[PDB]
Amino acid sequence: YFQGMTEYKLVVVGAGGVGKSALTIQLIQNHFVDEYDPTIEDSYRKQVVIDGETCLLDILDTAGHEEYSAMRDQYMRTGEGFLCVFAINNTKSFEDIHHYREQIKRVKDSEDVPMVLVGNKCDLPSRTVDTKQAQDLARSYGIPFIETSAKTRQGVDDAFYTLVREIRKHK
Ligand SMILES: Nc1nc2c(ncn2[C@@H]2O[C@H](COP(=O)(O)OP(=O)(O)NP(=O)(O)O)[C@@H](O)[C@H]2O)c(=O)[nH]1
Ligand SMILES: COc1cccc(-c2ccc(Nc3ccc(C[NH+](C)C)cc3)c(OC)c2)c1
Ligand SMILES: [Mg+2]
């Protein structure tokens, strides 16, 4: 019996400065944050309708630069889907995606975790990562790729909604 709307626990991961917080705040507040305030851990919530189903997104916004914590592994165990974010002007953030994916596969002990690859800051002219490279990486992992800008709001809804659709397909 229906006791309230379905809830989805999403975790936003990726290197320092790629725009994880900016993406989340654009989704929740329709606000672009220009300042860089490094995150340790922040929790957000939003009700949306995706494909005719009302649901609640519980979003955990993570730290880019973090050593081994068992506290980190805990929320990666409970998270049901992961936005893996790099910045299209930062090649290192793109190469770090492999490390986030491995970390997630290890803690969930699974090959088939709901995930979306997100290439953020697509409004900047200093692209160093081609769309095609990122699409090929996503195709090799069997996951969707979405280009976003927290500043223009391009792809922001889509990134989160796509992840929810991936979670739904997985169960
Ligand atoms: N032009 C542009 N700037 C962006 C975009 N997303 C984020 N930024 C900028 O990049 C900086 C870092 O954004 P922020 O969301 O804090 O990064 P983060 O990944 O949450 N960092 P951390 O892991 O330290 O928490 C900020 O100055 C922000 O305004 C984007 O899509 N376009
Ligand atoms: C442990 O690993 C996870 C992993 C992923 C998401 C979550 C999650 C995020 C936010 C909330 N909830 C929440 C969201 C925003 C606020 C802030 N309030 C001021 C509204 C409080 C709770 C949540 O609750 C079940 C779960 C937990
Ligand atoms: Mg942040």
Residue numbers in the entry: -3 to 167
What text appears in the publication on this structure?
The RAS family of oncogenic proteins is important as therapy targets because of the frequency of activating mutations in almost all major cancers. All family members function by signal transduction to the nucleus of cells via interaction with effectors (such as RAF, RALGDS, and PI3K) that catalyze phosphorylation of downstream proteins. When KRAS is bound to GDP, the protein is in the inactive state and becomes activated by nucleotide exchange from GDP to GTP. Mutant RAS proteins remain in the active state and hydrolyze GTP at a much slower rate than wild-type (WT) RAS.
We used these analyses to design of cross-over compounds linking the common diphenyl-anchoring moiety of PPIN-1 and PPIN-2 to the Abd-7 aniline fragment. All three compounds showed very similar binding modes to Abd-7 with van der Waals contacts to K5, L6, V7, S39, Y40, R41, D54, I55, L56, G70, Y71, T74, and G75. Ch-1 was found in four of the six KRAS169Q61H chains (A, B, C, and F); Ch-2 was again found in three of the six chains (A, B, and C) and Ch-3 was found in four of the six chains (A, B, C, and D). Thus, by combining the anchor constituent of the PPIN compounds with the aniline fragment of Abd-7, we generated a compound series showing good electron density for the entire molecule when bound to KRAS pocket 1. While the interaction of the high-affinity WT iDAb with RAS was minimally affected, even at the highest dose of compound (i.e., 20 μM), both the lower-affinity–dematured iDAb and CRAF binding to RAS were progressively impaired, starting at the lowest dose of 5 μM. Phosphorylation of AKT (downstream of RAS-PI3K signaling) or phosphorylation of ERK (downstream of RAS-RAF signaling) was determined following EGF stimulation. The PPIN-2 (and control Abd-2) had no effect on the levels of phospho-AKT or phospho-ERK even at 20 μM (addressed using Western blotting), but we found that the three cross-over compounds caused loss of phospho-AKT or phospho-ERK, as did the previously described compound Abd-7. Structural comparison of the six chains in the asymmetric unit show that compound binding has a minimal effect on the conformation of the switch regions in RAS protein.
